[PDB]
């Protein structure tokens, strides 16, 4: 009889069959495969060397000699030329596999890029048909100017990382050095978002209050009141006096540490508001919401300056927004793994850094905008080529636990990662340094202090906790 | 399919191998043979339907069949068959050499034959020259 091995494709003098597949093999090959992988090579069923049935029928007849195969040296010559073609074939396969994975990424990308277009037009068609179905009878330019240096200029000053920044061996001693209680009312406690400015900090409560707080003194600085629902996002202004906060009551209210009342209010959203961010000039507020809209306004006069629907015709969770101090090339995160950088003059996307299937809770640029990090509760965190719109590095873990917040350090050389638990990485080496389990519940917001020497956190454990070494 | 049944002799489309036989059958043949006789047609061992596995080809990863005639296994095979022939050839030559070399060593009488000729001729001379 005649048989060919499924692994090698050659004739075999020792045909054998696994009990867990129909395919037949040369015994010494499948045994060597089993000795590595313990599995059927084709069905991937678990396989052991005793589950092999042997065909005692006579193996394939010998291949006739070539006339050049009639002499021993010419067999060795033929064996050499045969061997070279076999190795070139094996080398061609690993090249072809690399090319196939390049093209698969690009087609899925081009497929997922087309789905961005289908989604916009389908809702815009739907809103057009809905009308029929119910028919009854400027600083941005200076931001471009600043972007026309700072996205390319900042090598001129950022020549080195700071010398006083924590070394990888030092941050390994991180421990919960303070614990804070009584920041918010005990009838409906909880802290859902956090921001800091040096040792000053600002807290959003489940009790529908915003509290200015000092996490070094363990002291309330000021309590701001006027929201009708619990807080969803906050920003603390570098002036140490102004504060901005966003709530489930669909409004944004601006406060001053001198005042018990609103410095300004933005009434600009259709549903609960989700995130806010500050222009690097300080005068202007940038905002996003669960209604699929984003809005941008002047803080210093209260005037709204531009607003657009990201995609109208559906209530879809935008859940992050940021400003980038070159002037532009910043973006928003939204429900269906959107991470869209915005062509702010044209009300359309400019770039993207998705890395997830699930929504993205936070987006942070580095000082010079040649690093960015993103993460999501589908269980990974990744570092991003702001300069070229590609992936660079990945953090991965066994459990794929929820990740609730992220933060660079002061410089972008460390990155805190966590949610159900907390860890910190030294990004300049890209190695894990320490694991922190002193929280008794999920973390909701993260900041780092100067030189990475401290870490500030809020949690569902009904406390605010600070880590340092 | 390329499998030929051992019992019907046809190229089968339902290839099945039985663990006791190590041999290839049609499914439609072996099930009724088990039903009517419970026995492997080849070895006359017992059979039961759990001892039967059905063959397949062309699954994912299954290498393309080499048809170029040359292969590394087949060249190493025939280089091995050359080597066995040359050693058994060389062994019989070595045996032949030992036999020939043995007897020509035992046959080394020729100097002792020469002394007998000397002894005979000297006797002859003294027996010829006495008158």
């Amino acid at each position: 009889m005649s048989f060919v091995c499924g692994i090698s494709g050659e004739l075999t003098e020792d045909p054998v069959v696994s009990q867990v597949s129909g395919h037949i093999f040369d015994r010494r090959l499948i045994v060597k495969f089993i000795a590595e992988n313990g599995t059927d090579p084709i069905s991937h069923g678990e396989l052991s060397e005793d589950q092999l049935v042997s065909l005692k029928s006579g193996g394939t007849g010998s291949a006739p000699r070539n006339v050049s195969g009639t002499s021993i040296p010419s067999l060795l010559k033929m064996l050499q030329d045969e061997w070279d073609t076999v190795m070139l074939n094996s080398f061609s396969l690993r090249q072809q596999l690399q090319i196939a994975r390049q093209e698969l990424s690009h087609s899925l990308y081009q497929h997922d890029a087309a789905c961005r277009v289908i989604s916009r037009l389908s809702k815009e068609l739907t809103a057009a048909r809905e009308a029929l179905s119910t028919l009854k009878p400027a600083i941005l330019a200076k931001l471009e100017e600043k972007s026309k240096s700072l996205t390319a200029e900042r090598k001129q000053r950022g020549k080195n990382l700071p010398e006083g920044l924590a070394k990888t061996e030092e941050l390994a001693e991180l421990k919960q050095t303070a614990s804070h209680t009584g920041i918010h009312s005990t009838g409906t406690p909880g802290i859902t978002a956090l921001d800091i400015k040096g040792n000053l900090s600002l807290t959003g409560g489940i009790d529908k209050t915003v509290v200015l707080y000092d996490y070094e003194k363990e002291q309330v600085m000021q309590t701001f009141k006027g929201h009708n629902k619990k807080i969803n996002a906050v920003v603390l202004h570098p002036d140490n006096i102004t504060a901005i906060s966003a709530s489930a009551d669909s409004h944004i209210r601006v406060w001053s540490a001198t005042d018990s009342s609103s410095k300004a209010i933005i009434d600009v959203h259709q549903a609960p508001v989700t995130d806010i961010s500050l222009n690097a000039s300080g005068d202007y507020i940038l905002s996003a919401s669960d209604d699929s809209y984003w809005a941008f306004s002047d803080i210093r006069s209260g005037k709204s300056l531009c607003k657009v629907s990201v995609e109208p015709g559906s209530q879809i969770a935008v859940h992050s927004i940021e400003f980038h101090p070159d002037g532009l090339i910043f973006g928003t995160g939204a429900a269906d793994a959107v991470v869209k950088i915005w062509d702010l003059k044209n009300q359309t996307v400019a770039a993207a850094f998705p890395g997830h299937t699930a929504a993205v809770r936070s987006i942070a640029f580095s000082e010079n905008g040649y690093y960015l990090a993103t993460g999501s509760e589908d269980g990974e965190v990744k570092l991003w080529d702001l300069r070229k719109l590609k992936n660079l590095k990945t953090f991965a873990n066994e459990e794929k636990q929820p990740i609730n917040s992220l933060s660079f350090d002061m410089t972008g050389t460390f990155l805190g990662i966590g949610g159900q638990k907390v860890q910190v990485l030294h990004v300049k080496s890209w190695s894990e340094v320490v694991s922190l389990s002193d929280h008794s519940g999920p973390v909701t917001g993260v900041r780092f202090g100067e030189n990475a020497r401290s870490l500030v956190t809020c949690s569902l454990d009904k406390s605010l906790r600070v880590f340092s070494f | 399919m390329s499998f030929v049944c051992g019992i019907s002799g046809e190229l089968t489309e339902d290839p099945v191998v039985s663990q006791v036989s190590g041999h290839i059958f049609d499914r439609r043949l072996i099930v009724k043979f088990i039903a009517e006789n419970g026995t492997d047609p080849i070895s006359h061992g017992e059979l039961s339907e759990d001892q039967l596995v059905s063959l397949k080809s062309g699954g994912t990863g299954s290498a393309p069949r080499n048809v170029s005639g040359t292969s590394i296994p087949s060249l190493l095979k025939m280089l091995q068959d050359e080597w066995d022939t040359v050693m058994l050839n060389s062994f019989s030559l070595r045996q032949q050499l030992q036999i020939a070399r043995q007897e020509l060593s035992h046959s080394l009488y020729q100097h002792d034959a020469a002394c007998r000729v000397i002894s005979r001729l000297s006797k002859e001379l003294t027996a010829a020259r006495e008158a």
Binding site: G61, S62, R65 | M78, D81, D84
Partner: peptide
Amino acid sequence: HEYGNVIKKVEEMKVRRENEMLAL
């Protein structure tokens, strides 16, 4: 060991000689 296929030569010669020849 190499030309063991000569069994197939005689078999195909035998099968060929079964043409224009008797039962069994």
